Amino acid sequence: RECISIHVGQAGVQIGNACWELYCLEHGIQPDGQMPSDKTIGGGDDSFNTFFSETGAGKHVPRAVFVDLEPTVIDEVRTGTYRQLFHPEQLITGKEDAANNYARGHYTIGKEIIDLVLDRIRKLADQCTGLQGFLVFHSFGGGTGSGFTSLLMERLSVDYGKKSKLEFSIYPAPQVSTAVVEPYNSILTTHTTLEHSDCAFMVDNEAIYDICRRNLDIERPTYTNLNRLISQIVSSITASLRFDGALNVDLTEFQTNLVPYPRIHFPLATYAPVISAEKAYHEQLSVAEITNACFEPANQMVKCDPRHGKYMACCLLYRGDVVPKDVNAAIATIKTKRSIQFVDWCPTGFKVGINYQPPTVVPGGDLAKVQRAVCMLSNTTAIAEAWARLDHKFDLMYAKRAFVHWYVGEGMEEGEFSEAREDMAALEKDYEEVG
Amino acid sequence: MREIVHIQAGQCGNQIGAKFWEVISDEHGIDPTGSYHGDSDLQLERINVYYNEATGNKYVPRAILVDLEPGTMDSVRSGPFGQIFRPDNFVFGQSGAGNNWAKGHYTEGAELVDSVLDVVRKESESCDCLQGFQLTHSLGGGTGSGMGTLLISKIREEYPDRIMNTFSVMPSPKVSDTVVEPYNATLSVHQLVENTDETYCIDNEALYDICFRTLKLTTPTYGDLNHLVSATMSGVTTCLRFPGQLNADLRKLAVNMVPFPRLHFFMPGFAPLTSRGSQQYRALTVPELTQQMFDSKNMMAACDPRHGRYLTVAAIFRGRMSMKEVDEQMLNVQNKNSSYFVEWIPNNVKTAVCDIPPGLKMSATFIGNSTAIQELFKRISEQFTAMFRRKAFLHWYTGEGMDEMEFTEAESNMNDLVSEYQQYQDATAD
Amino acid sequence: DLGKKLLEAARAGQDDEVRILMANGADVNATDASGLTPLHLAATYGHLEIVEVLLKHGADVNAIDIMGSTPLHLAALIGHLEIVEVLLKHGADVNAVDTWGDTPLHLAAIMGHLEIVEVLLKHGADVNAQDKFGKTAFDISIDNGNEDLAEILQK
Ligand SMILES: Nc1nc2c(ncn2[C@@H]2O[C@H](COP(=O)(O)OP(=O)(O)OP(=O)(O)O)[C@@H](O)[C@H]2O)c(=O)[nH]1
Ligand SMILES: Nc1nc2c(ncn2[C@@H]2O[C@H](COP(=O)(O)OP(=O)(O)O)[C@@H](O)[C@H]2O)c(=O)[nH]1
Ligand SMILES: COc1ccc(CCc2nc3cc(OC)c(OC)c(OC)c3s2)cc1O
Ligand SMILES: [Ca+2]
Ligand SMILES: [Mg+2]
């Protein structure tokens, strides 16, 4: 069953560029789309075909759309190492961006290109024998990432009602910020996308930044460093879609395993180990060590303290030299030794998936090769701390209606701010109520 | 978002405008004839923002020169890069406005404004992606202030979705003891509050003070003042014209710098402060630039930032230096000076580094949306009110067709502007 | 009505027309509707020679209009240093207060006429005079950050 990735705005495009590079390396697909280990030339039914179509020439093409309202970032994909990988018509650019303004992305500028994007998506969908749904990558803080994405998700829900929509969302951090209004864009897009998205993996730019500085010894991480770490995590999350495996094998199973109720659909990703490539001779960490590391807040994709929360679901996705009985033993020593508290209504259990191929390192990356790695996906109420921090910044500015004139001048009703914010308040309550 | 159409109106406007095109042409490798002699390519990646690529790898300033006084056209042309401007883009009258805003805005200037618009249309229609307009003008005169604001209003109607940015030189009796200038400024400020998205308040009071008190220039000339302007103008536009880690346009700047539509008057500040020729090559440390760019003595508006609060600040460091240092030093200034930033705009300080410097080794350019700028508006309001209470020279204005009520409305709108500033200066998070 | 013509001649700076009207009995102390005299107008518009001539012909150097402005107020507001001095030499009340409580010192200070400020001070301007809002000229200098003025006022 096919998965279409949509990459919206600069963050979504730059992270998408990094992900597809990694996917190609993981699958053995060359930058021109050729895949020598692919024995079926016409097309085929293999697991990597969920992400890649195949042309008659043997070219393996990402099932991916890149959209931005300005062309600078996508022009880099057009001229980069993977220029030949993508459908040229699946890289769509407007001329003028959303100016960090949700309302321009969603109402004014975004409407000029929405139907082209949907028609191009429809072309990819029509190549699909069984479209599972969409992976949507985007920033929360950008005007395109926030406003166009929510417009796009609204439209996708209409045109693809039964299809799952997963999001990888970049949550803004002051350390690497582009605008003062990002808290607004974040609440606005969260409010309007909450109903249309089945599962959303928030990547806290501050968490990735801190990991780059602490584990990778990178003094001032750039987007390239961040996006390389993120793509490793995204790859670990989507591996089950792309490879044989028994956990999370389709988009629906993500919701089944991680989303107990529709709105609290924000799993925390934790990844380990993250080791600098300068430590090429690093001692190899055991299954127990890396599993323990999944309960260290320092390895979390989102800054929050799961010791302050209750878990509702927990999946461990191992990649590499991982003996299942060692996983069981490590889980036994975490179920007893650590303060992991599930909610009373959820099986206090861990789902385990093991892909026995170790993670791929991107040439030029910051990461050392490792023999085993683990991505934990958990739905924990402690992620409500991330919303609270965002909601507080929002409230500080909205109290004075700072910047609001920019949104209202771009087709938006001021009441949309209060509706969005109340929806967030209810989201916070949803997490307190569950615990 | 790429092309900026630049307009310069009146004697001050043309004079600092010419200085701007000199300083940035030089910074982009362009010479007085349009030929690029730059040694680095990123000097041309973003050249299209301020230049039309004509014939012969020629780069022509996307600049419209306007003045009701024919005289300044000649001084513009006599200028270093005076032959660089499209001859078709010089729109000049015959009489001048005689420091009478009403002449600039309602009579002589309204005659010429259509001629200027036609050129604006020409230059705009040849734009791949027009981001908006930049006007250089004084507020104290008649053409720059009266016609300028008429020119702003007309452009606004035809191009409502584009950014209107001004470099507006505030009058000061220290530089021009002409007593109608408060009138002209106040009438102009009323226009700028409604029709511009971003106005850099360049204050002749400040420019004089810097030259006289700091640079120890005992008889500052316009040339000395304009050296501060052009450095400021280069600084504040760095990131429109140089790639950097920021993709800066006039609208993203507005969205992040203007929390309330009327509070769009920025106080620019620059470090290091230098006189013309001055061999002040001693350099400056990041912590020094960072402190100085935040000192009243470095502000181009005669305002003490420590008398108000910074709603938003954008700072452009230029030259070779650790973006990690600037990150640390800028955090440093923010926490040591925490009470001078509003707490209800999180992360309201934005920093860019840009490798290419201006002609020094290191500069910092500050763009503050500070409530302290009410001090400038209060200074002008008080002079306006002194004159207006006695109705001095009102007949110069009413005789051009202006109603006395336009004066009281300007003054009220300026007093309202000062109250708004005080309102957000005193607001707290709780 | 030569008074009305003298007023216009004073405003307009027509020296010869002033001399003539005076010689034909024009009221040197005629008033427009605002209570402005020819001397007020000549002082406002910078006509130094008309000011001197009116003053040799019976002009009340301290005439006030309806708002309490004396000619010295207007000369100090507008910045005509020579008229300020000529008015002071003919008995202008350096501390005259108008309907806003403004003294000529207040107006010269507000307008940045620093030489006039100095002259008024040498002529006995009261630096403690408060306008209707309590401001002395020194307060104005401090409130406006005019250090040049504030130095002058501290002498
Ligand atoms: N991790 C990561 N974050 C990014 C990247 N690019 C931008 N961001 C973040 O995304 C936010 C800004 O949104 P962008 O994606 O740049 O903006 P956009 O979606 O292009 O929208 P507009 O430019 O406003 O039209 C900030 O929080 C940035 O830190 C990237 O490559 N990686
Ligand atoms: N900094 C600066 N101010 C100027 C310059 N020329 C005029 N001004 C100021 O502008 C005001 C007078 O208006 P001006 O621009 O000369 O007249 P215009 O032709 O009507 O625009 C006064 O406040 C002057 O101090 C100049 O070259 N530089
Ligand atoms: C207050 O907080 C922010 C301010 C602005 C933004 C983004 C947009 C920007 N455009 C420019 C353009 C600039 O020159 C024209 C410039 O100085 C030369 C700038 O400062 C470096 C910027 S910053 C995001 C913020 O978080
Ligand atoms: Ca195949
Ligand atoms: Mg963008």
Side-chain angles (χ1 to χ4, degrees), chain C residues 45-72:
Chain C
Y45 291 78
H47 303 311
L48 168 64
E49 293 61 39
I50 289 178
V51 167
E52 254 154 354
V53 154
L54 297 173
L55 293 168
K56 305 173 153 146
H57 289 71
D60 184 356
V61 70
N62 288 319
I64 50 168
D65 69 0
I66 64 181
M67 298 318 284
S69 306
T70 66
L72 182 60

Side-chain angles (χ1 to χ4, degrees), chain B residues 10-12 15 67 138 141-144 169 171 175-176 181 204 222 226:
Chain B
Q11 293 137 229
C12 177
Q15 178 74 31
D67 207 326
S138 62
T143 301
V169 175
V175 172
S176 177
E181 295 190 358
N204 269 354
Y222 278 135
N226 292 359

Side-chain angles (χ1 to χ4, degrees), chain B residues 109-122:
Chain B
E111 287 305 282
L112 206 53
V113 68
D114 290 60
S115 318
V116 181
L117 290 177
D118 284 326
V119 183
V120 180
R121 276 155 228 198
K122 267 103 199 192

Side-chain angles (χ1 to χ4, degrees), chain A residues 178-180, chain B residues 235-236 239-240 246 248 252-253 256 312-316 348 350 352:
Chain A
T178 78
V180 176
Chain B
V236 301
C239 294
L240 307 175
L246 199 87
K252 282 186 172 197
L253 175 64
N256 289 304
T312 52
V313 176
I316 177 47
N348 56 348
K350 168 69 169 191

Side-chain angles (χ1 to χ4, degrees), chain A residues 9-10 68 70 73 97 144, chain B residues 252:
Chain A
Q10 162 173 314
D68 202 359
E70 58 111 359
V73 181
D97 65 19
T144 300
Chain B
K252 282 186 172 197

